[PDB]
């Protein structure tokens with residue numbers, strides 16, 4: 001089906017048989033999208049193996065894909081027991097999951113979780129203090145991974161542990177048992193998908209559900225919600241709240257160290273709203289406008305999901321172009337967030353973009369770090385609050401500086417995760 | 432997912448891992464269904480490999496599966512360039528194909544084809560005459576296969592050839608290039624379906640389309656109908672009108688020879704409506720009530736499609752039982768057509784079942800030789816007329832008797848086609 005886009009008069013790189021365009025992935029998903037946007041412009045088509053993928057960059061078309069024609073045509077992502085997971089689930093079954101999980105992520109239910117995750121903010125500082133007193137730079141991912149792992153367990157299960165100081169709490173190690181060659185192989189060869197996580201891990205969770213069959217799990221329990229449906233959601237939660245939270249935090253702290261003006265200016269906002277290391281609260285966080293700007297700006301530079309995808313369930317025509325059924329429509333968020341067409345000096349870190357003065361000039365469909373429409377990121381409010389509560393406690397206590405080992409400029413990982421090439425390592429000084 | 436039916440409280444044979452229930456196929460699809468109906472009764476569940484299949488035998492439930500909830504839940508068959516074929520096509524794309532082909536199979540367009548296929552009835556007789564004069568029995572499949580191949584080409588393409596006397600007319604041989612180990616392997620292992628007809632054959636057809644891109648093909652041309660969409664339909668047509676037509680004709684002539692009372696009684700109906708070997712016409716065929724009864728009764732005994740299947744697209748509850756999504760619902764036509772619950776002496780051949788006196792007692796959802804609902808057999812009227820026009824010319828000229836080589840009782844093929852175990856071979860005498 002390599003002839004498809006040329007049959008539609010849609011430009012794009014020339015697919016090779018079988019491989020499609022995946023050989024262009026050597027520069028990384030995101031550079032491909034950026035090279036692609038530069039030369040083909042506003043729409044282009046490429047092949048993930050034999051799978052055609054249509055990339056759109058027009059905000060009207062995007063709104064039509066993510067919001068307008070969502071339930072009708074573009075309801076699902078491509079599929080590539082976890083078929084129950086809300087992100088993989090499809091059509092009426094996704095709808096069902098989403099409707100049952102929508103109240104679990106209310107602004108409401110977040111305010112109740114704030115005293116819980118705040119506490120792990122206090123734990124991050126002590127671990128940070130341990131290293132700062134040593135006098136020497138830190139590998140952010142180990143203390144932000146420890147923080148993010150601690151938070152996500154007790155939020156989804158209510159087990160109070162300390163990843164960084166409790167080596168093998170039996171729940172700790174099994175949580176660490178998470179993990180590409182696969183993806184690339186499957187992108188070109190998804191035709192071995194109907195052939196193939198440790199059965200060991202699902203059990204201890206499906207088991208662990210019992211101790212609650214007696215956290216998200218309760219709010220979820222609050223067609224019947226199959227216990228194993230419940231397990232599929234928690235695993236999606238654990239991966240979401242782990243890998244994303246620690247990565248974004250690394251990216252923020254790198255931007256704060258390389259811009260001491262922003263960091264100290266953020267430290268001032270924290271010191272006025274929360275005088276003398278006052279404990280962060282839910283209403284308080286929502287007051288810190290410059291913190292909101294610092295977070296949104298780091299997510300503009302580093303949208304960890306990179307792309308947003310929808311399958312075209314039927315032959316349709318949106319805003320004047322014909323989308324055949326089975327085409328994957330792709331919104332290249334990364335490339336869009338760095339497009340001189342919509343952003344000034346896109347490579348620069350300028351939190352003032354999102355000022356109450358300039359936030360209104362921003363097209364919500366160009367800026368999609370959490371996606372948009374009914375199928376956008378459900379854990380958005382929680383993710384933002386999880387990260388903001390960590391930054392507050394940290395900048396209430398420390399200031400961060402680059403070191404000889406700080407990789408400046410930060411280079412991105414060549415693979416399919418959005419993470420630093422080299423781990424962010426910064427000097428930590430107690431204020 | 433072998434635990435699924437026991438989790439639903441649905442009885443059925445005990446699946447083995449991987450294999451599911453396919454080891455029960457040794458007796459043949461149809462006997463399995465019949466053994467199954469006998470012991471589990473009105474609903475049962477079995478596994479084609481890992482694929483759960485729910486068999487229903489209640490006429491209300493069947494109506495709900497084939498007619499009521501067709502477009503909503505049970506729109507497609509299981510999928511196991513031919514994705515364009517109308518029988519394999521799905522949802523709005525099937526709808527599109529069906530709507531474009533509906534007028535091609537009108538009662539109207541059939542009346543125009545009658546002079547065409549009548550002519551090949553005259554050809555069958557000459558070939559039959561050749562063998563009858565020899566004085567000796569005939570292998571029905573060779574002269575009914577020749578007839579059915581001749582008819583289907585000129586109906587779908589308008590090429591006047593004589594399969595039995597033209598050895599290798601280039602269109603003849605390529606048509607013969609049609610053809611189970613696959614099915615069974617794929618039933619248990621459909622998980623290699625995303626890995627795999629001669630590319631040679633599609634070409635000569637996709638090519639041949641040109642000579643008409645300048646028959647069904649025109650009526651079809653009479654979203655755009657992709658030339659290759661056109662090719663997918665014709666191949667479905669060629670297989671339909673070949674293998675089914677010749678098989679049913681064999682089955683009819685076997686029932687006519689083993690019941691000379693019916694055959695001579697059918698010969699009388701033909702001689703009154705069509706005096707002195709008068710040429711059959713469209714209005715004339717539709718007058719032969721006992722011919723209609725003989726055909727319907729042979730199709731009751733021998734529904735060549737055997738089963739009717741629908742995939743459950745979403746979790747629903749029909750007439751009081753819960754059908755989860757992705758379950759294949761199966762209506763075991765064969766077993767239903769031979770169920771003492773609805774038929775008297777089901778093994779007997781009694782065309783009087785369908786008399787104008789007793790046809791009204793017949794439940795259209797128990798008797799589904801062509802299926803029912805929007806997705807029933809589209810070539811039904813044409814198939815019936817194709818066979819009736821052949822029987823008329825034949826019984827206008829010959830009477831058929833069993834021989835030493837006539838396999839009485841007729842045993843059925845153990846495989847997955849519905850055909851005689853041994854080829855029907857009958858003595859042919861000129862009247």
Ligand code: HEM
Pocket residue numbers: 066086087088098236237238240241244245248303304305308309368369370371372373374375376377378379380382383384
């Ligand atoms: C800053 C960290 C995160 C970012 C940048 C992020 C971003 C995204 C994006 C871009 C999408 C796709 C939406 C679309 O295609 O329109 C998504 C989906 C999703 N996200 Fe996140 N996410 C983050 C953290 C989390 C967390 C902590 C959770 C929950 C614990 C979560 C739960 C989900 C779910 C369930 C979906 C799928 C929603 C659906 O299919 O209906 N995310 N996220």
Ligand code: HEM
Pocket residue numbers: 497517518519529667668669671672675676679734735736739740799800801802803804805806807808809810811813814815
């Ligand atoms: C006596 C010979 C035949 C018999 C017993 C027969 C029977 C059947 C049956 C039982 C079905 C399935 C319907 C359902 O699942 O509800 C079917 C489908 C179909 N039949 Fe036939 N058929 C015969 C000959 C033909 C011929 C000659 C053609 C056309 C040339 C044809 C075209 C079709 C098509 C296109 C479908 C699929 C319809 C759809 O998916 O919408 N059949 N047939």
